[PDB]
Amino acid sequence: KSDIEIAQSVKLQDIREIAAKLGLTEDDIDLYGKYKAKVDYNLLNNKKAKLILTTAITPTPAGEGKTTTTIGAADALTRLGKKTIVALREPSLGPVFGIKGGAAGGGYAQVVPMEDINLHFTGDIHAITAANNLLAAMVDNHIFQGNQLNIDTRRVVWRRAVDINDRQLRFVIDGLGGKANGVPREDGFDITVASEVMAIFCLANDIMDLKERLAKIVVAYDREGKPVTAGDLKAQGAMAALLKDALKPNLVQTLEGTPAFVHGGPFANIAHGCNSVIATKMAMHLADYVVTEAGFGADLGAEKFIDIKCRLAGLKPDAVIIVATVRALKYNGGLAKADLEKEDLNALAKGIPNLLKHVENITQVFKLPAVVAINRFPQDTEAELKLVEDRCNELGVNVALSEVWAKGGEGGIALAEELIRLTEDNKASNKGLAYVYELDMPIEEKIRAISQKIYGADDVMFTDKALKEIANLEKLGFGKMPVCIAKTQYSLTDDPKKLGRPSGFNITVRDVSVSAGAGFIVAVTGDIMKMPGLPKVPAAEKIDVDEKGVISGLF
Amino acid sequence: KSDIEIAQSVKLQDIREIAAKLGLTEDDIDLYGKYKAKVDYNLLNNCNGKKAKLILTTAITPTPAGEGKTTTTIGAADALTRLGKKTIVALREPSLGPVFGIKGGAAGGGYAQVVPMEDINLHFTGDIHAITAANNLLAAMVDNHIFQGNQLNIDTRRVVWRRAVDINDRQLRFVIDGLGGKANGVPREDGFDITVASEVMAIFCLANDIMDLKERLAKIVVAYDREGKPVTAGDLKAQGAMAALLKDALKPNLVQTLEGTPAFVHGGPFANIAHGCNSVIATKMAMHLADYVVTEAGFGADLGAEKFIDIKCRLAGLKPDAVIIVATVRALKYNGGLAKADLEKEDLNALAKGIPNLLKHVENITQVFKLPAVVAINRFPQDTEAELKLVEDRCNELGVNVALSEVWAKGGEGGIALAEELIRLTEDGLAYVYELDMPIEEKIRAISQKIYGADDVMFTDKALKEIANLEKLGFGKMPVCIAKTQYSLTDDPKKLGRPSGFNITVRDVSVSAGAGFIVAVTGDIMKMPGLPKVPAAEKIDVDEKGVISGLF
């Protein structure tokens, strides 16, 4: 019984009745069909919820069902009589046509309508694409019309975008055709959700902060090295006007009718891998418990959820879910696929340190309440689960068995109860929030602080190129903001083949740039794909529509 | 009072009420906010009309300062509604591009508007994004096929498909893509057009339903192989996915006039390289849901009206019941040589030198297309009683009445005389300029001689060769779409008046095999406008509440 079969076999509730559960009326929402609606963001200036973060262990090529657990947890809280909202990211449209689409969640833990969310949804990503490309066209128009700001054509760092998996646009030359048609320069397209516009869209408090952030975008450098901004080009009003409706969070729902926001969807390497701040804040204003998540494992996603999103937005998670599976741990202990359906306590024993490292980071470094969610598969023996529970309990952390894939909200009551226990009226902590690094430190000491404390690196090495880039960013006033580290998700090191809990290793930063409007430094550790390619046989080939307009072949 | 202020000062009816006027339940429509809806296209095949009376709004040869064809189009519909006739106005959705370069504008004007005006000028219901995505998906699939082995044996230098963005971006007119070594694609020359110039928009507009959409896309010629044979979107298995991307967009957008007349706004191709009409599915939907439908075509009757009949009506199987030809006194005086500025003071000489242009359009409609015509004049206050009488007198001598229209100032009240005449014209086989079985040259000669009044048509040696390749490849039974300047009946924009003793020169001929017509270019054709020195974008702004200002 497919995710698509499951999603189609369930009568969804009209979105006005889902909105009713949040005390929203016809006047608070803009409908986009029967099962989708945008919530006016002006509600946010007239108490707040407990915030739960769903993160996970180091990911495998397949998955650990993080998003599925994130949905399942919210459905469970709802059943226990808690007014709850699950907040998630919108997937980009590109992959749907290359390597198949997929569910928001899975099993009986989904957010729906599945088909619309995968396609145009409410048009957020299209608005973001238009804004990015307007900016680019305004940069080139300015150069063409006389280049008053003295932009060095070879130093425009702003890139164009489309939400299609198109390798042909990674490296291009545009502005050709003689003097009436542009001025030649090297350029390229990123997949829309990699644009700084998407990261900014997700870190904005409101429409005004969006506009002020957009204005700070560095689009190019002039001929003596000084940054030129979207503000210099007077683009920020037009971009924000283009993003006016998009920035209203999208209200949809779970298979059990828990209210749900789907909004924003940045990269989790070159950006912070979270859904939008405005949506998270909206959920906390309308509910008593909010469940959300961040991309990849807890070394990237949660680190950036806390040290970037929470920091700049002024939020604090009240508890963290660390998702794990017996399979993924045994893979981390070096068992190799196809050999993972059999019980192996030795292999599991060698995989647990990874989980423990992530639990240690959440409980000791970030100092947050935590529960471990094992997504129970059928072949998970009684001993294997007991083993995970014992090792976790020795750090003082509980394990909840999650069966939400198979049973929906009923399969995550134990997790939900633990989360209620963990967050029990004890907010306390006038302290504030524990971050990995402080803002006033130099860029290399933040990268070092993250690499050592979170990844468990001995140290971080820097190339001469990286070092020079850091120096010039310190000068230009960018030395006092969060640092986003772009590395592989499949390992705690920057070498993806190093599984388990690696030690006696370093990270190596090869490139450092600023997302000035987003408000963070991006530190790349090698190669980061910004535009995926279509396979030999794209999924598009088998996507069809019939006489009556029903789409087939997306899943 | 400005157009946006009027559009923001009128209290609009919930679109569900508007839908009810047409007998549509909750149920039959997808709401996009309180004042917009998409109507399900499965209501077509549904049952059986009982088709409406179809009214085509066209115009004289345009000047830079427009003649308000759209406003008259909206007003004739509002008038008809006030005369108790169940009416829908059908219009084109405008592209986003120009709004950020030279500021947007009303859908119509004055008290003859379709609204919400802001939404229509931005993302609306997202139709143009779906189109852009479909076009750009196909382009990605063409390149992927080449990158992955190139079974179809495409010549990389003969990929004629082009990418799309709805931004006025001259930087993308001419590009090289597929650079960065073997891992990043295959080098070729390429470029973007503005989205609404893509064949996907023309096909979007000519499709009868979702199955006709899919089958038209399959026939898109994306490239040629190394031995001259066309490769298609169908060969790439792209048509299903393109249609999936366009599944919702293809449902017509139901909105309203200021007075609450049901309006469709849907589709919007060029009127030079394409046919300049709103979508067939929206017109057909309107003719199904109503008794009168008022719609329009881009530019003057030599371009828009010619193609509305010879391309849209031919392929869609429609027949207009009457034609409105819009003109103004100022426009005619301009066309009779009077050089701007003075287009304010009376000048019965210059008017009499402009009128022939009008009479040529009237002749083409009433004698060549053999259709009931009415000339509607958008009366300005500075128009003298004698100027207006001279236009009426010259028109009455050909058998055509003149209705004074003041729908700009007075709304539907100002189009009563026009509407009453339309009722009279529609109470008291379609004639095409050419037959499909004629060769391409002869079809181009037919339009040029009968409609523009040219002596003959000249072709370059390149055009003759291109034409011949299309004849042999089996594209010779298709309608022909002549792309040329709108500001003149010739292909020289300077030639105002009713020019005599001229020829047209066809310099380039290609095919939109999906859309089903040949495009014949006669001069420079700008498919991607650029931004001015100071883009309108610079003064567009949004406040903490999320109100946009500076858009108009």
Ligand SMILES: [K+]
């Ligand atoms: K999507």
Ligand SMILES: [K+]
């Ligand atoms: K560049």
Ligand SMILES: [K+]
């Ligand atoms: K538009």
Ligand SMILES: [K+]
């Ligand atoms: K080309």
